[PDB]
Each structure stands twice: as structure tokens, then as C-alpha cells.
Design an enzyme around this catalytic site. Structure first.
Site, short mmCIF file in Angstrom:
data_model
loop_
_atom_site.label_atom_id
_atom_site.label_comp_id
_atom_site.label_asym_id
_atom_site.label_seq_id
_atom_site.Cartn_x
_atom_site.Cartn_y
_atom_site.Cartn_z
N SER A 1 1.08 -0.98 0.04
CA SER A 1 -0.29 -0.01 0.48
C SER A 1 0.58 1.27 0.24
O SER A 1 1.96 1.60 -1.00
CB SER A 1 -0.85 0.25 1.48
OG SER A 1 -2.04 1.45 1.24
N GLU B 1 -9.36 -4.85 -2.00
CA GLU B 1 -8.81 -4.09 -1.71
C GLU B 1 -9.69 -2.52 -0.70
O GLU B 1 -9.19 -2.41 0.58
CB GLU B 1 -7.99 -2.94 -2.69
CG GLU B 1 -7.23 -3.90 -3.14
CD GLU B 1 -5.82 -4.47 -2.64
OE1 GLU B 1 -5.60 -3.98 -1.17
OE2 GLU B 1 -4.81 -5.26 -3.12
N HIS C 1 -7.48 -6.00 2.59
CA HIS C 1 -5.71 -4.74 2.09
C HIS C 1 -5.16 -5.91 3.02
O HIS C 1 -5.21 -5.50 4.27
CB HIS C 1 -6.43 -3.69 2.88
CG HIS C 1 -5.70 -2.58 2.01
ND1 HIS C 1 -4.84 -2.48 0.99
CD2 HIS C 1 -4.64 -1.79 3.25
CE1 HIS C 1 -4.00 -1.33 0.86
NE2 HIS C 1 -4.49 -0.89 1.85
C1 LIG Z 1 -7.56 -2.79 5.36
C2 LIG Z 1 -6.26 -3.49 7.12
O1 LIG Z 1 -6.30 -5.02 6.83
S1 LIG Z 1 -5.33 -2.47 7.30
C3 LIG Z 1 -3.59 -2.64 6.71
C4 LIG Z 1 -2.08 -1.72 7.23
N1 LIG Z 1 -1.59 -1.46 6.07
C5 LIG Z 1 -2.08 -1.75 4.49
C6 LIG Z 1 -0.64 -0.81 5.86
C7 LIG Z 1 -0.48 -2.75 6.36
#
Ligand SMILES: CC(=O)SCC[N+](C)(C)C
Ligand SMILES: *[C@@H]1O[C@H](CO)[C@@H](O)[C@H](O)[C@H]1NC(C)=O
Ligand SMILES: *[C@H]1O[C@H](CO)[C@@H](O)[C@H](O)[C@H]1NC(C)=O
Ligand SMILES: CC(=O)SCC[N+](C)(C)C
Ligand SMILES: [Cl-]
Ligand SMILES: [Cl-]
Ligand SMILES: [Cl-]
Ligand SMILES: [Cl-]
Ligand SMILES: [Cl-]
Ligand SMILES: [Cl-]
Ligand SMILES: [Cl-]
Ligand SMILES: [Cl-]
Ligand SMILES: [Cl-]
Ligand SMILES: [Cl-]
Ligand SMILES: [Cl-]
Length: 532
Positions: free
Chosen positions: A197, A324, A437
Site C-alpha cells: 500500500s 482492497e 487489504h
Molecule cells: C485493511 C487493513 O487490514 S489495515 C492494513 C495496514 N497496511 C495496509 C498499512 C498494512
């Protein structure tokens, strides 16, 4: 002493850690910059002045100051992403996992955490690099960088708060790895930077920025791309948000100097408390302080750099997850909740579209609505929910990434694309959220190899498969083992546009990932919003 390493900045002493019935060396909390505190808040980082004596690198460093997610107190699904160490502005350190015995010149992988540029820690359990360092024989580095206003407050023209300093933190860490990783057995000319991300977007930004290109060999981008509607702002918008932040804290706004002076006198939590009040629209998947297209770190607009091939030419491996956007709808869209199936009414669907595409006028919203609605059954809560989930993921992650991959491949030296669609059997988040995500990360870092974590045997096989693809790519610029009997991950070409799914099933090849929806997001909608 295998745990004692003398670097250009001074001597450091790591610790021996256990891993899958074996052991490796770990050097945690190595400083790469001077603490960005006091009058150095919002300023570009300074290299860490060398030290005499031995730096104790046996434990994790502090995490940078950041917003803490308390939407579900005590819930592991969300708290596993929160800082697990004390927070402090004195947070510029990096961690290193070195195989045992120490290598002489092996592949290096540097992890850049995500978190929407407003959060993130290099110390999370899911980012522990020992499993990968041990299993694949690589030197695994995890860096850190300032987030929130601390790393991205941007008052272009000013020299006290130029913006992008968080990205310069990352670069300084990359410079440190370039200069000292050899002492840990790593090959400085075979460094692969990877991140998810915001970390993936960051990786892409180092590919673009001339000042970062020479510090690494290749890259991996997971669920992120530099060109993402949320990963950057113009210098004007950056300035507006900086001013508004000051306004929230009763700051003198007569000059940048005065604004900055005021912001520097505030306690970290004061800035964090009002950080979200500066967003221009009611929206989701939008963060206040992010990289700025300033003309320094980024010479020209990202799109013009991509079109002209103004970026590092090397090999890249990248991909996305199936769902996502579910996380972001849960946290801000009406009708979604953690303990229900979140079946969405037509009304809430409409509200969701508006939150997801803040820059769209009414016609644009009708366009998005028409594209993602089943008019034969538009009151179907499940379809409404899934449709919204797709809108958020397509607009914020997948289509921007497909645009990047299409542009990069024109000039690149090799592209490998994946679609991760396997939901972890032990996921604590509700089923409606799907392949969330960030939930491909645990597989990339080999957590499924740990029995007590409770992943299926199949999921352990997927993790090993993924870790080998990543490490083999980092080492050779190709995820495929030369002359192996395994299924081949085909190169992504402009002509065929092939990619593979990453799941527990036998690897299958597909083409034109999300092409129907991405033509809408990448070609049509922009023309529409421009013409109207
Ligand atoms: C949608 C989630 O479970 S938060 C994940 C935070 N990250 C993308 C920066 C690892
Ligand atoms: C990558 O570049 C090398 C030359 O440095 C070339 O031989 C090779 O064919 C290129 N690979 C691709 C797929 O672009
Ligand atoms: C780091 O090493 C020192 C030895 O100098 C040890 O005493 C200390 O416990 C370690 N750091 C910690 C865990 O405080
Ligand atoms: C995914 C997130 O944690 S964004 C929600 C934060 N907010 C309440 C300040 C908007
Ligand atoms: Cl030296
Ligand atoms: Cl273990
Ligand atoms: Cl800058
Ligand atoms: Cl933008
Ligand atoms: Cl001002
Ligand atoms: Cl504070
Ligand atoms: Cl505002
Ligand atoms: Cl938008
Ligand atoms: Cl319509
Ligand atoms: Cl495109
Ligand atoms: Cl989980």
C-alpha cells in the site's frame, strides 16, 4: 562475534533469535538519522552522527508518532497494525535479519511499511523478517519513516517544512543500506525494495525520483502504486492542509515561519488529534498528509514522468488483493459494521459511492453508479455491498496499479503481475470483507510456517511458494527458478498482459486484470469529469 558488526557509523551488537527450529542474527533499532525532534520537526533528515562504543541493537526501536486505531479495542484484527512499541518523534531506525552464519554477499530486501502515510511501524509481528531471512537466505531490512504531519506537512517554498521528508527518511535509510549492508553480508548492488500500500506507493516513488534510483536494484509493489488518487497532493493542496492544521491549533497564520514555529511547539498528540479535520471532502481512503508533487523529489507530474519513461528501468514484481476496499468501507461507510454481514440498502450504496469518489460531480457519480449496479436487482444488499467494495478497491488500488503497470512496462526491463485471492483460514475479520487489504503480507513474511499461528498446510505451502517467488525475484529479477519443474509465472507484456493468481490452488495464468472496470476508471471517467 557473529553478533558484532562494525559499520561506517560505528559498531553495533545484535542478538541471536530462534526461527523454525534454528537461529539467525538480528540487529534491531539501528539509527540511520539524527532524531528529527525540536527545531528539526518537519525538516529533511540528517544522517546519524557516528558513535564510539557499541550500539545495543538487541531490541526494537520506538515507533513514529501516529494516529492509533481504537475503533475495535482489544480486537487483534485491528490492533495488529497499531504501534507495539512506545511512540516517539525519535523513531528513525532500521532493523536487520541476517542469516547464520553471516553471508558474504547475498541478496538484500528492504521492507517499507504501509499505513496511508499516516501510520505504520517496522516492528509489527507481521513484519518480522526472520522467517524470510532464514528460509530464503536473504538479508532482510525493515526501515521506518515519519508519517502524518511529522513526515508530510508541506509548505512548498519553505525550507523548514518542504514536504516529502518522510520519503527522504526512507531514502536516507536506503543510503545507509547502500553504504553499510556489506558488513552484514548483504550485496549492496542486489537490493530489492518492497512494500505494501503506502509502502508500495513509496517504492514506486523511489523508482520515479532521480535521487533514489541509484540506491536499489529492483522493486516489488504490493497493493500500491505511486499514481494512486490518495498517495499524493499538489503543492497548493499541501499548503492548504498545512494552514488548516495550524488553524485547528489556533496558530498564527501570517507567515510560513510563524505557522511552522507554532506547529513545532505543539505536543505530538495535539497534531494527531486534529489531523483528520483538514481533508477537503467527506471521504474514505483519503489521508491528510501524504507525498507532494513538489518539483524536487518529483521533477514533473507523475503522469508525465510515466509517459516519457522518466523513471528507473529495471524489473518489477507487483500485484493486488481481491477485496482492497472492504476495510475502508467498514471504518467509514454507513451500513457497514464488523459484526453483521453488512448488507447495503440502495440508500447507503449511494452514500458510499459519494464517499468513494469525492472528486466527482453528479454525472460522474451516476456513471460510477451505473457501472456498478445490477439494475435487475438493485435492492440486493449483498450485491450493493460487493459492488461498493469493488468501487473502492478498483478506484483506489487496482486500476491505478494497472495504469502504472501498463506505463512502466513500455520502458521497463521485466514485469511480473499477480492477483492474490486467497482469504486466510484464520482471519478474525468478518467473511464479507473477503481477501482484505494487507492480508497477503503475512504470507510474504512466512507467518504460515509457524504452527502455533494456525494456518492450514496448504497455506504454509502458499507462503513458501510466495516467499520463494519474491526472494528469487529479488536475487535474479525473475521469480521463476531457472530450470525448475514448477509452473512458470509468465512475464507481463504490453501485448499479452498476463498475470497469475496467488492462492492455494494450482497456479493458473490469466490476462488483462480488471480491464473492463479499469477502462472506465482510467480512460472514461477522467474524460467525463474533464468535459463536465
Ligand atoms: C485493511 C487493513 O487490514 S489495515 C492494513 C495496514 N497496511 C495496509 C498499512 C498494512
Ligand atoms: C532486460 O535488459 C537486458 C539488457 O540489459 C536485455 O538483454 C533483456 O532482454 C531485457 N529484458 C526485458 C524483458 O526487457
Ligand atoms: C542490550 O545489551 C545490553 C548489554 O550491554 C544488555 O544489558 C541489555 O539488556 C540489552 N538491551 C536491553 C534489552 O535493555
Ligand atoms: C482506516 C482508518 O483508521 S481511517 C479512520 C480514522 N478517522 C476516524 C480519523 C477518520
Ligand atoms: Cl569503516
Ligand atoms: Cl519460529
Ligand atoms: Cl522536498
Ligand atoms: Cl492526485
Ligand atoms: Cl500561512
Ligand atoms: Cl504527545
Ligand atoms: Cl478543510
Ligand atoms: Cl475521487
Ligand atoms: Cl443515470
Ligand atoms: Cl491504463
Ligand atoms: Cl487475522
Amino acid at each position: 562475534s557473529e553478533l558484532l558488526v562494525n559499520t561506517k557509523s560505528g559498531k553495533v551488537m545484535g542478538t541471536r533469535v530462534p526461527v523454525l527450529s534454528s537461529h539467525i542474527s538480528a540487529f534491531l533499532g539501528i539509527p540511520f538519522a539524527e532524531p528529527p525532534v525540536g527545531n528539526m520537526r518537519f525538516r529533511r533528515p540528517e544522517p546519524k552522527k557516528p558513535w564510539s562504543g557499541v550500539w545495543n541493537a538487541s531490541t526494537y526501536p520506538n515507533n513514529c508518532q501516529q494516529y492509533v486505531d481504537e475503533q475495535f479495542p482489544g480486537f487483534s484484527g485491528s490492533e495488529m497494525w497499531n504501534p507495539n512499541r512506545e511512540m516517539s518523534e525519535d523513531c528513525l531506525y532500521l532493523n536487520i535479519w541476517v542469516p547464520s552464519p553471516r553471508p558474504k554477499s547475498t541478496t538484500v530486501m528492504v521492507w517499507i511499511y504501509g499505513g496511508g502515510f499516516y501510520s505504520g511501524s517496522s516492528t509489527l509481528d507481521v513484519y518480522n523478517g526472520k522467517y524470510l531471512a532464514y528460509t530464503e537466505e536473504v538479508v532482510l531490512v525493515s526501515l521506518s519513516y515519519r508519517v502524518g504531519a511529522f513526515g508530510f506537512l508541506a509548505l512548498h517554498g519553505s525550507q523548514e517544512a518542504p514536504g516529502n521528508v518522510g520519503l527522504l527518511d526512507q531514502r536516507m535509510a536506503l543510503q545507509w543500506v547502500h553504504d553499510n549492508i556489506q558488513f552484514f553480508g548483504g550485496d549492496p548492488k542486489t537490493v530489492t525494495i518492497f512494500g505494501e500500500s503506502a509502502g508500495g506507493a513509496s517504492v514506486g516513488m523511489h523508482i520515479l525520483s532521480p535521487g533514489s534510483r541509484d540506491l536499489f536494484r529492483r522493486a516489488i509493489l504490493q497493493s500500491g502504486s505511486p499514481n494512486c488518487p490518495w498517495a499524493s497532493v499538489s503543492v497548493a493542496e499541501g499548503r492548504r492542509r498545512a494552514v488548516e492544521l495550524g488553524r485547528n491549533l489556533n496558530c498564527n497564520l501570517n507567515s510560513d515561519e510563524e505557522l511552522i514555529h507554532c506547529l513545532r511547539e505543539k505536543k505530538p498528540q495535539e497534531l494527531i488529534d486534529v489531523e483528520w479535520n483538514v481533508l477537503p471532502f467527506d471521504s474514505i481512503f483519503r489521508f491528510s498528509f501524504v507525498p507532494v508533487i513538489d518539483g524536487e523529489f518529483f521533477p514533473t507530474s507523475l503522469e508525465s514522468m510515466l509517459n516519457s519513461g522518466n523513471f528507473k528501468k529495471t524489473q518489477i514484481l507487483l500485484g493486488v488483493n481481491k477485496d482492497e476496499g472492504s476495510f475502508f468501507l467498514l471504518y467509514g461507510a454507513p451500513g457497514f459494521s464488523k459484526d453483521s454481514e453488512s448488507k447495503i440498502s440502495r440508500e447507503d450504496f449511494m452514500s458510499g459511492v459519494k464517499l468513494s469518489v469525492p472528486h466527482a460531480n453528479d454525472l460522474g457519480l451516476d456513471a460510477v453508479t451505473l457501472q456498478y449496479t445490477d439494475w435487475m436487482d438493485d435492492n440486493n444488499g449483498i450485491k450493493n455491498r460487493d459492488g461498493l467494495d469493488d468501487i473502492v478497491g478498483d478506484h483506489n488500488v487496482i486500476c491505478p496499479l494497472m495504469h502504472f503497470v501498463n506505463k512502466y512496462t513500455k520502458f521497463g526491463n521485466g514485469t511480473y503481475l499477480y492477483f492474490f485471492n486467497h482469504r486466510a483460514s484464520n482471519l478474525v475479520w468478518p467473511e464479507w470483507m473477503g481477501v482484505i487489504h494487507g492480508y497477503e503480507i503475512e504470507f510474504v513474511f512466512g507467518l504460515p510456517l509457524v504452527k502455533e499461528l494456525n494456518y492450514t498446510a496448504e497455506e504454509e505451502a502458499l507462503s513458501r511458494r510466495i516467499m520463494h517467488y519474491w526472494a528469487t525475484f529479488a536475487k535474479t529479477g525473475n521469480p521463476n527458478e531457472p530450470h525448475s519443474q514448477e509452473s512458470k509465472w509468465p512475464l507481463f507484456t504490453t501485448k499479452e498482459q498476463k498475470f497469475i493468481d496467488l492462492n492455494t490452488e494450482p497456479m493458473k495464468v490469466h490476462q488483462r486484470l480488471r480491464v473492463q472496470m479499469c477502462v472506465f476508471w482510467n480512460q472514461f471517467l477522467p474524460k467525463l469529469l474533464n468535459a463536465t
